[PDB]
């Protein structure tokens, strides 16, 4: 029983997520010339490209181009921006001066990176949008690259976040009033239709919204309601196993992790079957730890900050699923959300407790703060044993370990994969999408001894933390795969790539979309 | 209200403890020759003794002896084992080869140790049993020592533990399927009858079971039910003061420690009066902290692991009591179990709270993780004030302090004792039983000032941690002894001796049995 | 000025390393039958192979085979050993019984591992050699695998270490008296000649010796003298830049790191040019931190233990170089040893000091315990700018980061490589040699910003430690490569693979040999 005022706030927040619509739309130079007739949308325009692209003669045909803009192109630093005023340029806001911000994108890109460097595109547009005068304007963003998918996601990510509690926004269901409408103008008609690019951008931003949201708003219950709302609207199936039913049905892992919390844990499975014959059957599984306090293995306060992001894997997987449904991608999908709060209290699972997992394997809990692998263990067994089909590929996505950052860094999700082919394909999808990945060691024979237990089948924590920490957490999860499953298993550790110093990045959904696209 | 599946599991676990039967039986060479006619029980035999004992001519008359075994005796290292195959040796398993494992026991033994070195006996047999081929076999263990009590307990302790959650054992009420039946074969008919040695072994192993068990299985409630089950079966009295009744009846110490937990605290008192006139009246009191998270003074995770062992003193005292009832030892006994979980939550007793103990004395709580001395304070007052008799001797056993390990180590329980005579006797009982002890400083005049309080009669924590930390915890407990009590008080700190790297040792019950035997 | 007794001890230790000869020799079953005529070398024989290999009919033709050995094969556990006595088997020691120890090697091997699992081979032979009765015996080790290179190195690694200070060995220049001579018997004549396998084994063991040795013995001076000794004996060139001359010649990195120490730092370069036509040119550079106390950024004692291993990269590179010279491999080599002790005192380089590197680039020292990347920076610039040739490939090997263990674990060295091709080749060499490697993220555009400095060209420490810690250290080193260099750069982080719980592994030399072999 919550207070009435808190429950109304939660319902309104749910609705804000279910009805979320993007601020971004897409077009091309010829279509823009034709529809707008050389009238800018507002008093701000943005021009982004490489050193070489910015000097293409076609740039001179752009409606805002003049000798000041030419000088901006000369003075702008690589990775930086440079702004100039253009007097008496026609625009729909009737502004006397138009501000034109040029941004230079590097060409330097390692073999493990996206050649189009959408990371810099995001930062350039963000910086340029900080020069916005008025609210509710439309900003024309002219991009010289034709790498449409990575640019779409990059721009969706950029600028002020749709989630906000600033300046009375709490009374408007935490919908920001500071976001500018963005018109992305490609050089050529995009290889991917504009409406499809919109769906991608929408999923990136929704993912961002879910991750940014504080846990007083995004709970196990509200996340579930959001999933149910999208199921009603788009017509996909939803199965929910809630609270004590998890225990009764043998889901000891997710039950034990989540049982101390105010809001009960939930295993939420979503099903989508395309019209006609599917190219693959794929089961998605996401770590939905709505808040990771550590449990009895309580985190210090420094480390507990930003643990609202611990559901970033569930958000990624959920929004990737939504994109697939909206674009009618020809993949049969399950999406299992492992929703729990890792809370501290009298019902807390303990450091010493022995858990009977859904898989039938027993787990000695060494450290309650290694909760993610436990909920995922139940998730992947569910996906591989309990559904109406057996998947060809299982993809689990999780903000799983600190080791991930040390290993592969802030921009590359770690991949632990049982097959070379599935790994290469996910890497390729990362490089095409801009949501980059990198492999971690796959060597089960060396991971297995780290989990030896006196009394149970396994522990939940490596004996020696300095023995491939990203990999070992992946290994743990694989021990709970059903024997019925003989296909590819892709573990994605996205602990760090889901956020930066401005908040959530919406990393994961576009990665999935691109992966599905190439199956 | 627990889930139905969890409650069924708890009942089954209770029953497994109440009906626990040992895997060990005892006999002697002549009786073995006569009953088995030179046919080994299985494809494994074990031979354990000192360098000199192994070279006794009587060893050559053992049914598995041959020149390869003789060579094993030559090659085996002190404290080590050495295995050989014997071809065409008659055995009940019909194995073509019998494996004979020889183990050499040192003679070196300090004045504070058991001369028969049962510590090494345990490790030798454990190592030998790791060479077991099949399940459910009987292994003949030939021991060359006649120190029957320490060997009985040593062998009961050894090998795989009766508690297990491995390989589906959770569905069999956590009864291990990996334990071998062990036939211990002494050189001479044992000075203590085989059926009596069985009862001792049973108590060692039950104690081990209770200590090994994770706190999701062994709770304040299930521990109580187990005690009640044994009371029905053996016909001894049981008194239970439960939850809020502890507060109403003035038991502020145990109530305050346990009140935050999911399962309520309990003061459980068991009574046994022998048929004859008793040699002594003895009150046992045991720290039954089912799990020590530290309370609001929360333990870090490294330190919180194995805190399921924090009820080792209650297990020891409980199983020593059982043995006394089963063997009808002529001692009048009370056994008070101080059962609580030291949990963290909104009802947690605080660092600053002032407790009114049953004794009438007030305790200022400096640190909630010094919970044991508090529950014991109520326990010993109960024993010395509230029973139908006044004891001559109070023995409290507790996994009480980290200082214990630093002071007396992993194999020797620390003794804090108000009389030289009772101390010497408990030391002698430790040396005879193998469950060795060592004294800590008894000096109340120096302990007393460490507990000075501004507002209460005393604190629960020493001001200066480096001033006889085993002793000061003992001192605290003695301040709550009833003034009606004028007898011997033996405080046994067994923090480390109750476990090793394989889990529980079942340390304590045999110590008590031997102590009672010599009264 | 050292005491006379210490100087004599150091000279003798130097000589022990310079004259080091292996305990291992290699042959095959037919050559063994022919030379030894079915007579075992001693009272111990070892049989090692997979479950399938151990049941090959050819096993029955081995001279020690009998029904007891057959039973051993049945009873042995995967990854374990099992020993039996064989009566009246002919052997050179005239022993009445021969002990035969069987060891089972797993077939399970991930795509990132050596299929022959030499890691288990090492452990099996180690465990078998623990059953050795007498000193100075020869032990026949029958291996059922034909993977000769990885087995050679595996057996060289195994058992008791040639470095010892036990039982008066200090008086014998720390040459162990506990090492058994080992005769490795392959099924077929080895694809690599026995004398070549010996040279490999010798380098593995010498490497192990240098790493095991305490820093009171292996100093910057003695390591130098050892290199000089090998140069005189084998006829290769040696260049030494010592102490203050490092400062005068602009080697500010290695000079600053090492200048606080009792023994001066040294840049030691070795040159080998093969007879004839010109071939691949490779420059090796090794981190030779004889002891890493942390400098002014002092390590706690727990972390400072085993920092004698911090010269493992210099040892690896040195011994790989020796193997190339002994086998006359057709590669032109330089080998630069970056020798320093990272010591604490009044001359200590500081957290704030600004270093002028040999490369001309300035380094702001944030943390003196990140010393390795600094000495290596001077090393690689030396190799790529100061030699009589320019290398095609630079390989640096270093026990560089804690992040390495977290990322790629205890058995896999981390690879940071500027070219896909060179990376793949080093990986292949790891899988063939058994000295396995795994890549870490190569993404200089993301590493570069971590080293931004206010006043110098760069810092020596990442601003954010959780942003690809293995990779960033590698990146730092690459900033000091000469602009004259346009080839492949392979950075090998072997922090953890150079040791296990028994001490040094001798990891690195064989990896190099195999890499050179395939060029
Ligand atoms: Mn988490
Ligand atoms: Mn956690
Ligand atoms: Mn305690
Ligand atoms: Mn405590
Ligand atoms: Mn170092
Ligand atoms: Mn260092």
Residue numbers in the entry:
A (entry chain D), B (entry chain B), C (entry chain K): 3 to 521
Which sentences did the original study use to describe this structure?
Leucine aminopeptidase (LAP) is found in all kingdoms of life and catalyzes the metal-dependent hydrolysis of the N-terminal amino acid residue of peptide or amino acyl substrates. We report here the X-ray structures of three kinetoplastid acidic LAPs (LAP-As from Trypanosoma brucei, Trypanosoma cruzi, and Leishmania major) which were solved in the metal-free and unliganded forms, as well as in a number of ligand complexes, providing insight into ligand binding, metal ion requirements, and oligomeric state. LAPs of the M17 family of aminopeptidases are bilobal proteins with a highly conserved C-terminal domain harboring the aminopeptidase activity. They form homohexamers of approximately 330 kDa with the active sites facing a central cavity separated from the bulk solvent but accessible through solvent channels.
In TbLAP-A, the carboxylate oxygen atoms of D294 and E373 and the main-chain and carboxylate oxygens of D371 coordinate the metal ion in site 1 and the carboxylate oxygens of D294, E373, and D312 and the ε-amino group of K289 coordinate that in site 2. Most LAP-A crystals were grown in the presence of manganese ions. As LAPs are reported to be zinc-dependent enzymes, crystals of EDTA-treated TbLAP-A were grown in the presence of ZnCl2. A second data set was collected from the same crystal at a wavelength of 1.3052 Å, between the absorption edges of manganese and zinc, and an anomalous difference Fourier synthesis was calculated for the data sets at both wavelengths by using phases from the refined model.
